[PDB]
Amino acid sequence: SMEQVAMELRLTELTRLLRSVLDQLQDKDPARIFAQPVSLKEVPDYLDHIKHPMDFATMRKRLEAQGYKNLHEFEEDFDLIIDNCMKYNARDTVFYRAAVRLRDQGGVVLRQARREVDSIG
């Protein structure tokens, strides 16, 4: 149908906007602490601590499969990145501190993204 196509064009444009949002959030992580999945070879107990691991490469795979239906789903995954880190790592660590800074800096980007998603529909 023509409606299914219209729908698919919206999803494609949402994917376009989320790609730009993901790029902006990932620039707030210049140390690349959140770039890839925590290695289960190097942290063999990780899944005993963290039940839903997340990282920027995993988000990008979902993104490029047009797997985010709305901004809320995308934000859920960004929040997992931050919240997993803040639980696994203690307050006095470079990892925890990197998450705090990512959360704080990403807030600005996500504030305007929400406005853009509502605005453009």
From Swiss-Prot:
Scaffold subunit of various histone acetyltransferase (HAT) complexes, such as the MOZ/MORF and HBO1 complexes, that acts as a regulator of hematopoiesis. Plays a key role in HBO1 complex by directing KAT7/HBO1 specificity towards histone H3 'Lys-14' acetylation (H3K14ac), thereby promoting erythroid differentiation. This is Bromodomain-containing protein 1. The chain holds residues 555 to 674 of 1058 of the full protein. Highly expressed in testis. Component of some HBO1 complex composed of KAT7/HBO1, MEAF6, ING4 and BRD1/BRPF2. Component of the MOZ/MORF complex composed at least of ING5, KAT6A, KAT6B, MEAF6 and one of BRPF1, BRD1/BRPF2 and BRPF3. Interacts (via PHD-type zinc finger domain) with unmodified histone H3. Interacts (via PWWP domain) with dimethylated and trimethylated 'Lys-79' on histone H3. Residues 9-113 form the Bromo domain. It comes from Homo sapiens (Human). There is a cross-link at residue 41 (Glycyl lysine isopeptide (Lys-Gly) (interchain with G-Cter in SUMO2)). The gene is BRD1. It is found in: Nucleus; Chromosome.
